[PDB]
Amino acid sequence: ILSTASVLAFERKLDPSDALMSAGAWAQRDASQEWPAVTVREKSVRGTISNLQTVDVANLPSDADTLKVRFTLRVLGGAGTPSACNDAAYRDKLLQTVATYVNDQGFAELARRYAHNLANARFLWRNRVGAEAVEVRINHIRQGEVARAWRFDALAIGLRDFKADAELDALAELIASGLSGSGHVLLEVVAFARIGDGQEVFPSQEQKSKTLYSVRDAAAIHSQKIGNALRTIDTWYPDEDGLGPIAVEPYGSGKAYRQPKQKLDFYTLLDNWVLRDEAPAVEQQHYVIANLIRGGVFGEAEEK
Amino acid sequence: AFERKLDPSDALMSAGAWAQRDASQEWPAVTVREKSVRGTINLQTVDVANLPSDADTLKVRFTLRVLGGAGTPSACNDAAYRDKLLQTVATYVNDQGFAELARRYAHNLANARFLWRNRVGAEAVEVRINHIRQGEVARAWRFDALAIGLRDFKADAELDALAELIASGLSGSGHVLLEVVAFARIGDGQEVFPSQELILQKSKTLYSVRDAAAIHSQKIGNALRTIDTWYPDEDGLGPIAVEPYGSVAYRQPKQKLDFYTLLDNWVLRDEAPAVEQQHYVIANLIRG
Amino acid sequence: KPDALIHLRVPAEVKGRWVKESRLEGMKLTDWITGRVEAKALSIAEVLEEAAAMARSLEDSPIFYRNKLCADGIVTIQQQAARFSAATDDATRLDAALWAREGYQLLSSGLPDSYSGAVPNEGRTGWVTASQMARLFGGEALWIERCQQELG
Amino acid sequence: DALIHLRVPAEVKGRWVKESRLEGMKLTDWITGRVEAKALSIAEVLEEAAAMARSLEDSPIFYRNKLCADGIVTIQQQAARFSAATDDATRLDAALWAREGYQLLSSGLPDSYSGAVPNEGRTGWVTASQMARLFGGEALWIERCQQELG
Structure with missing residues (x-):
């Protein structure tokens, strides 16, 4: 028996990377390279009256109103x-x-839903709330250059129900081809969230408690957190x-x-x-x- | 004895626009309706009196006659x-x-105390008082009800003139008749407050004369005698x-x-x- | 209806700066001042919050136990007011706001019509608070028309 | 002294007079304050922040950890201290301190939720978003406080 x-x-078959954070101006997002990385500093904060706690804080510069969060997701077969x-x-x-x-x-259904969670910018866990506008660039990078590009309105597609879309179904089919075994697929995913001139950005977590996650002195969302967002x-x-x-x-x-x-x-x-x-x-x-x-x-x- | 020596009348209510009060005879009377109001989480019934959506001032008119003896x-x-x-x-x-009593009576006439609740929350209150003899008005008085106090009797030329007239009425040298109009700028389409009658279903029925809201004569007399x-x-x-x-x-x-x-x-x-x-x-x- | 006029006596520099900013903003001066006053002026939603606050203040006052009408109106203003902030359907809001004043109307019809002495003890009469609530809501037809225009 | 003439509908003037009488001021002074509005006010910002702090206070996020509760109490305390002040220095310190309370709360808030949309009671993300819009940036708020009160 x-x-x-x-x-x-x-x-892991949906392997994402750490999503690096950078700060810039909305109207320059088309030329979003070289955007300075969002650094996490540790500030001192005064509390209750009956005394200085210290906390990690990540903010945009006083002259930047948009957060660029970029990672690379690779789709494997088998x-x-x-x-x-x-x-x-x-x-x-x-x-x-x-x-x-x-x-x-x-894998058509799963690939469609995964592409939905990529396009809605759900991986912007707290950075998505309170944003004036969120936009997702998704490029099917092959040799090292883009083979196909996608541009999505993260707020328009929402976070409540997977619906059919002409441009989104192409990405769904690509992810399904990747998962099926017809070739590993590599996508670069950038999210532009206009969270507000000089506002607070929120990287992943872990005297001071709850220290913010950073890679090479740059704020980032952990790959595991992106994977958690992907599979909702x-x-x-x-x-x-x-x-x-x-x-x-x-x-x-x-x-x-x-x-x-x-x-x-x-x-x-x-x-x-x-x-x-x-x-x-x-x-x-x-x-x-x-x-x-x-x-x-x-x-x-x-x-x- | x-x-009654200070005999007032029921004060009928009408609605109009402020600054149009000089020609206030045409002014339509304030009607009392019976509305249904939703209660605590269920429909109780209450009498309600409001001004039209295009009227911001309430005209309250009565006739008071002062007699002697x-x-x-x-x-x-x-x-x-x-x-x-x-x-x-x-x-x-x-x-x-009667000088002291007459001055205090004229004070309570001029301060518009008879506008019991209609006086509070009003932007401006004005009292016109006409001593009427025969079919025409012998004399006229115009007062700022809010300007003169509600806890203060002070000397004023025109108010002392009204006091002397009320003293003439009280002394017995001839009964005097006054028409008293009050203009209260209560607010575009606001609530007016006629006299209440305890309903011993309806909760509290409002007093009205000939489909017009009014304050009962006894309430005017109570206001007069403060x-x-x-x-x-x-x-x-x-x-x-x-x-x-x-x-009290x-x-x-x-x-x-x-x-x-x-x-x-x-x-x-x-x-x-x-x-x-x-x-x-x-x-x-x-x-x- | 016919229009009405409003005269503003302000310092000369204030008028000059307002004219400069208005010409910069691409509107006529009257329209500029009108939009600037309306923006921050008042809210339909805000009014309910206030009226409920005044009702809860009256709750700890003698006027709450004068008769059933006053207590029912106070509780109703709060109840309906709360219901209003629960959102997601303008239909309910339109209903909750009309209910809000309906509770007020109940309170104002339960309030006394005469007092003793010179000035009313506000705790025992609540006339000034009711005046403030009537100012908040406005007229019956005015408030109902505003609610149907905003949440229709 | 100069005068400005306003052509408005009668209903608009009636509503303005009602609001002016409600607030206990004359019409010209009321509309003058409204036209020199300048949107958010450092004091109205702190008052709304205290209101949002109370709304979060009567919920589970209040008992999540010491950072959230301390931030809520700090926002409210500093708004109260600002309103009952007498010298611009105390007002400045209270406004800065108040944000420091917002920052404490925001660093105490969770970073992930379950389901499609977060339950605001257990996450407090939308309330923190609204008050963060109220305050603005850290450096922006500090510079604003130093320009107005410093």
């Missing part, structure tokens, strides 16, 4: 193929299952699917939505799909392969 | 008592006169209404300052009250 692999790990396994039969059946999915569906795809959780998408986690993690009592959690779905040959709903197939694309260490620490 | 009673009393009561009132009128600043131990406090017991700030019966005790001691025991208190006695004699 087939049993789940004791050890089963996957590798979602179902694990990185470490220890059951030949389980890995073979898992490869058969994932191959049957990729044949039947082809799941609108298939068992209750209140209309209120919006959440991130793809094994138990949908603010208690768990994908509870292993409703059986809709990732582990139960995968076990029923692979071992017992009872494929879940097509939507849940999307969910299972979405957290396979995310990658991690799954598997059984003790036999079932 | 108990015969305050001491002469209406109740058929024992004649021996009435002779001494008339003698006492006559000796007062000779010695002191004369006495002679109640015990309150200098800065303004005058209150003249009642026998002066309840009160002339307690135990204190010899009550109306009945003072009047009986004055006429029966020939113990003349305080000078200030004489007026209080003849003032609630005028009240009736």
